[PDB]
């Protein structure tokens, strides 16, 4: 080559948890932190 990327996202959507996600959604994951674990 999105047709399969969207499907990967919709497969990974609900497997993700909620408590830890809310714990992670308060962090300023600036450019370094966002592109380090990749």
């Amino acid at each position: 080559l999105l047709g399969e990327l969207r499907e990967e996202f919709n497969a990974l959507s609900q497997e993700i948890a909620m408590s830890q996600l809310i714990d992670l959604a308060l962090l300023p994951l600036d450019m370094f932190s966002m592109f380090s674990g990749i």
Binding site: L1, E4, E7, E8, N10, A11, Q14, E15
Partner: protein, 265 residues
């Protein structure tokens, strides 16, 4: 983790749909195409395998997961078909002079058979149920059968004179023979060239997918003449080339794999 046991399963109707397995089962599975020599002959290219693999790459199937396994003819493929993959696709040309051969092939690969050996010289066998048959493979099988009465005497055939026996096959590379279930038969076969095995048809192998590339649907899988069914993994195309066929297979491979289900056995 019980093996070889069957137990009651339980559940409910409030469950959320867990996942979406496509684009992961592809990565973690292997696909195997079975194409005829006619197709490579019409193509005349040494890179079409890599090309199709790169194409499948877009559909998500990675490089080292797709395989190709040529076969000269339907007979040569029916002789001991060793289908060992997590997903199998088979292309099948139509020929009115081969309907029975390519229906036996379908009945063999589509269905999961439990096959015991047979020793003709000593023992005389009989079929118990409607799903019990005798499948003969080899270069050329020539089968003859004499049914027998209760006192091990022939009926229309002489136990000593093989010529009196009744012929059901004549130099076939694959036979699937169904005879009267409940009577003992004495058999004659070219055992030095072909082997016969007493098989029982279990449920269907959901791992393979046959694709008749030409004529109308004719495959009478079930031996009985009343059902003449047609399953999900029995497909049909109309053709004038093979590149279009392969492109279509690629573009609709996801449908094929939704029609196929990994094995239980």
């Amino acid at each position: 983790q019980n093996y070889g046991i069957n137990l009651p399963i339980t559940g409910s109707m409030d469950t959320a749909y867990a996942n979406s397995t496509q684009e992961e089962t592809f990565l973690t599975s292997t696909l195997c195409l079975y194409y005829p020599t006619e197709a490579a002959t019409e193509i005349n290219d040494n890179s079409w395998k890599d090309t199709l693999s790169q194409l499948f790459l877009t559909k998500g199937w990675p490089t080292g997961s797709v395989y190709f396994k040529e076969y000269t003819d339907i007979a040569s493929f029916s002789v001991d078909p060793q289908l060992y993959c997590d997903y199998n696709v088979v292309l099948m040309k139509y020929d009115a002079t081969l309907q029975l051969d390519m229906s036996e092939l379908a009945d063999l690969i589509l269905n999961e058979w439990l096959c015991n050996p047979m020793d003709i010289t000593l023992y005389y066998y009989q079929q118990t149920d409607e799903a019990n048959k005798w499948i003969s493979m080899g270069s050329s099988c020539t089968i003859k059968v004499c049914p027998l009465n209760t006192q091990t005497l022939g009926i229309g055939c002489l136990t000593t004179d093989t010529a009196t026996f009744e012929e059901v096959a004549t130099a076939e590379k694959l036979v699937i023979t169904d005879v009267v279930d409940g009577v003992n038969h004495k058999l004659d076969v070219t055992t030095a060239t072909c082997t016969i095995r007493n098989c029982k048809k279990l449920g269907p192998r959901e791992n393979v997918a046959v694709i008749q590339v030409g004529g109308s649907d004719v495959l009478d899988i079930t031996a009985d003449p009343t059902t003449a069914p047609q399953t999900e993994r029995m497909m049909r195309i109309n053709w004038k080339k093979w590149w279009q066929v392969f492109y279509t297979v690629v573009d609709y491979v996801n449908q094929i794999i939704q029609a196929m289900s990994k094995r239980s056995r």
